[PDB]
Design a protein around this ligand. Structure first.
Ligand SMILES: Cc1cc2nc3c(=O)[nH]c(=O)nc-3n(C[C@H](O)[C@H](O)[C@H](O)COP(=O)(O)OP(=O)(O)OC[C@H]3O[C@@H](n4cnc5c(N)ncnc54)[C@H](O)[C@@H]3O)c2cc1C
Ligand SMILES: Cc1cc2nc3c(=O)[nH]c(=O)nc-3n(C[C@H](O)[C@H](O)[C@H](O)COP(=O)(O)OP(=O)(O)OC[C@H]3O[C@@H](n4cnc5c(N)ncnc54)[C@H](O)[C@@H]3O)c2cc1C
Lengths: 477, 478
């Protein structure tokens, strides 16, 4: 239990029904607080958004998209993957939300980068790229070791142990050279009888190094990205529908756009518009989870230094586009089940689905790009985004990328109402971040931007839990 | 797709209802053949065997085990994981057998090895072991590069490109040293506000190198092992129950122990015992999928050189033991969801389940060992196997490994009736004996994973079946 039971009658108004707001309300309700959540959208979850057939969104350019994905097919437009250490998994257990493996590493997906080599724009499987990179890296270090270059820092026994590892790790020949490997895979698959298959032949060391084909390998080691990774069965938003049901829709107002938030003698008063009608609520405390760049637009009585601090959390660009195909060509032709291809192209990566394996259709995330490479899609119409996504994807996965397309749906977070950002990038543990951890009398800020896991649900959930703890301690005093 | 409709009446008898025999029967039927499968066990799938509540097995030592796993809980005693290139996945599609990801790599599982270092017998997470190993490896290669040791094989531009890669790959400091990394993980998890968490500190370079904590990293790169890997929901045996259902139980005799296989004028006659009674069946062709070391025990009229060739496929030892725990401590305490811990101990590895994530109970594969390290379990009683498994596992995962144990079940393939081997190793390893056994012996064809280039994979058995069925069809077509 996060906190004990509160004594007496105490109320909180929560602004925003994304992860931070819903977690706050859930934990406060458990402890016996009166809670009301005000959410501007007509769905729970905020930047956790899962697109399915029937999903409709009008972006800030006024373009309306209507998703027509087949029944049971979806993709996560925002949050999609969860590492094992995140409290998000603890909440899935608490809420009864089934999880499954998320394919965050795949030997059979492709890398494709421009370079001043003949590999420029050429797709290479991760296993082939890794075998060559680690093969030559191991050969080079073994050579330097054998040459005596490391004799001042490695003993004879150290050298022997290192050499043994390098021969194994690089699949080196008996004489210490990288000559290729079954780890690269096969042009023709080994089968029965005399069908030995045909190993894919290695690139040259100069090709490997000068192509930068290993530039994405360290992604596999990210603390928040290393396998095993997880995701809820049927979409990430299921966590937030589960929170909603535990909180009770009687305690959440959807379609409630907050327009004012003020400390008053009675507590905190929040004005909002819902169903075109003007409403007001007063509670003893407020938890404001509205993205920080949007808070200043509210009528408010926050001190100037707080308003300035909020402006330091700079918006960031990110977006995705999903294409439903009526043939799972990635599985049938490329032998790709989940995972992502990686590229320097604007699309940045192509992410293959982790569900409906071996079915008749599926949604591919044709891009998930951020920063400069999302700016390249943000101002395009959806039709233009799709055309660009298909063109770039076909340069990686071939002409099959252009065929069997049923429908598509995109989001760009900076252009999305009530988000206008994928996640915060603080100017310069900064003074402004630290300032915003303090209450403004009875108003508390919470959200992933006020954590050390920005752009992770874990950040939002831990922020919520800290703020709830602070309110509870204050009430106790 | 494999073959397109045979003309007239043609029959095949298939000896063995494991993957090769069932695949053979399935494809022959699709092409219009009369087929009968003779299987000694009461279940389809052979070395694909899934232990669940109600499974009873009497091994060749006379010990009977009765599995009492909770409903829905199981483990694969034989085949358990499938890489993306294997035709096994295409059969799952054809048969409507749902698959899920198999966790074959996990940053949070442990390595634990003996060495002449302070890491001897100490559990280290894969991510910490990898960060330290690749950190110091990268530091050392960058040092050698900067020193000029590779100036004869790398240009100035190559050196700069390599240096850039190594700094990133090893998470090196700006001046080229490995000083630790968030990649190692945290003793306290980063949270909100000023709760930054605390990174796990690195081991020293010599300790890391001499500990051999990286000795299993290359497993991640195995062609048949690299992620992404898959497995059927509810057990690998679902593939073979699906084959059984498509073939029809009317075309499969279970509890049929073949005792004789002979070429005869009209084809092949196979004698077998079923329901205590001596039976005989004759068909135009036979496909024999009985493991090769067991074929010589049959009455037969195979030529001497064929009998000799069969003996070159040497049997091997492998086994597993599963423990149902009433608390998923690996998830709740160690933040391990699937994957395997790896060790030099006899248990060899501890494999955590890939289903029922976040639930109240689960089966852990407390060992999966082969060769010498399975010989250490083969002659032990199940109770002794369990005691050894728990002792060794507790040395890796702590006292929690000994708690909340509900039940257990083990198999050792050399001691298992109708298998007596996990898989074949051909003496001299194609070897001449392997090549010889690809040829028909008049109307008898051999098939199985041992007659493939994917021995110990269902893919090997399935491609063998397909090749043999194709040969029979081409011959029938003339
Ligand atoms: C592209 C992308 C990729 C991501 N990848 C991952 C991932 O793989 N794994 C992971 O764990 N997380 C991921 N995330 C991060 C995750 O989505 C966030 O950490 C989480 O949603 C933050 O929760 P929050 O409550 O702080 O903010 P939000 O989710 O932004 O919620 C704020 C809420 O406030 C509401 N609101 C705004 N204005 C008003 C108003 N005027 N009145 C009332 N309500 C208002 C919004 O509608 C919204 O529901 C990703 C997010 C994005 C966008
Ligand atoms: C420990 C272990 C781990 C494995 N790991 C993997 C893995 O992860 N992935 C994977 O794809 N594969 C794996 N396999 C390999 C897979 O199980 C085999 O490739 C496959 O079962 C071989 O099929 P088969 O038909 O050639 O032989 P078998 O499966 O051995 O079938 C032979 C059949 O013959 C029957 N038989 C024997 N004698 C008689 C008789 N006298 N009369 C009638 N019938 C008889 C047997 O009962 C059996 O059903 C593993 C196997 C083991 C044992």
């Amino acid at each position: 239990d996060l906190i004990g039971k509160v004594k007496g009658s105490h109320s909180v108004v929560v602004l925003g029904g994304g992860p931070a707001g819903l977690c706050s309300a859930f934990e406060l309700q458990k402890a016996g607080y009166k809670v009301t959540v005000l959410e501007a959208r007509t769905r729970p979850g905020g930047r956790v958004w899962t697109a399915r057939g029937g999903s409709e969104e009008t972006d800030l350019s006024g373009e309306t998209q209507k998703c027509t994905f087949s029944e049971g097919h979806f993709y996560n437009v925002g949050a999609t993957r969860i590492p094992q250490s995140h409290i998000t998994l603890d909440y899935c257990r608490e809420l009864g939300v089934e999880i499954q493996g998320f394919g965050n590493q795949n030997a059979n997906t492709f890398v494709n980068y421009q370079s001043d080599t003949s590999l420029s724009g050429q797709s290479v499987t991760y296993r082939a790229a890794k075998a060559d990179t680690f093969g030559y890296m191991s050969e080079l270090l073994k050579k330097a070791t054998d040459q005596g270059a490391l004799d001042q820092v490695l003993s004879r026994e150290d050298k022997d142990a290192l050499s043994e590892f390098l021969s194994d790790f690089g699949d080196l020949s008996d004489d210490g050279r990288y000559l290729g490997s079954s780890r690269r895979g096969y042009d023709s698959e080994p089968g029965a009888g005399l069908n030995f298959g045909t190993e894919k032949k290695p690139f040259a060391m100069q090709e490997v190094i000068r192509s930068g084909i290993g530039r994405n390998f360290s992604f596999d080691f990210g603390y928040d990205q290393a396998m095993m990774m997880f995701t809820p069965v049927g979409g990430m938003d299921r966590i937030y529908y589960a929170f909603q049901d535990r909180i009770g829709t009687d305690n959440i107002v959807f379609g409630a756009e907050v327009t004012s938030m003020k400390n008053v003698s009675e507590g905190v008063t929040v004005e909002y518009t819902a169903g075109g009608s003007k409403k007001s609520i007063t509670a003893d405390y407020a938890i404001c989870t509205i993205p920080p760049h949007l808070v200043g637009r509210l009528q408010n009585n926050l001190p100037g230094d707080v308003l300035t601090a909020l402006k330091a959390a700079k918006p960031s660009s990110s977006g995705k586009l999903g294409i439903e195909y009526s043939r799972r060509w990635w599985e049938t032709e490329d032998r790709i089940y989940g995972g992502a291809s990686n590229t320097d192209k604007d699309i940045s990566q192509i992410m293959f689905p982790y569900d409906h394996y071996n079915s008749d259709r599926g949604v591919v995330v044709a891009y998930y790009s951020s920063g400069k490479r999302q700016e390249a899609f943000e101002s395009l119409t959806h039709r233009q985004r799709l055309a660009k996504a298909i063109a770039e994807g076909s340069e990686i996965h071939g002409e099959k990328y252009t065929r069997d397309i049923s429908s598509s749906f995109s989001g760009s977070w900076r252009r999305t109402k009530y988000s206008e950002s994928a996640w915060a990038n603080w100017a310069g543990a900064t003074p402004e971040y630290e300032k915003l951890l303090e209450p403004v009398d009875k108003i508390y800020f919470a959200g992933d931007h006020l954590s050390n896991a920005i752009a992770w649900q874990h950040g939002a959930l831990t922020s919520a839990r800290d703020v709830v703890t602070h309110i509870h301690e204050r009430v106790a005093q």
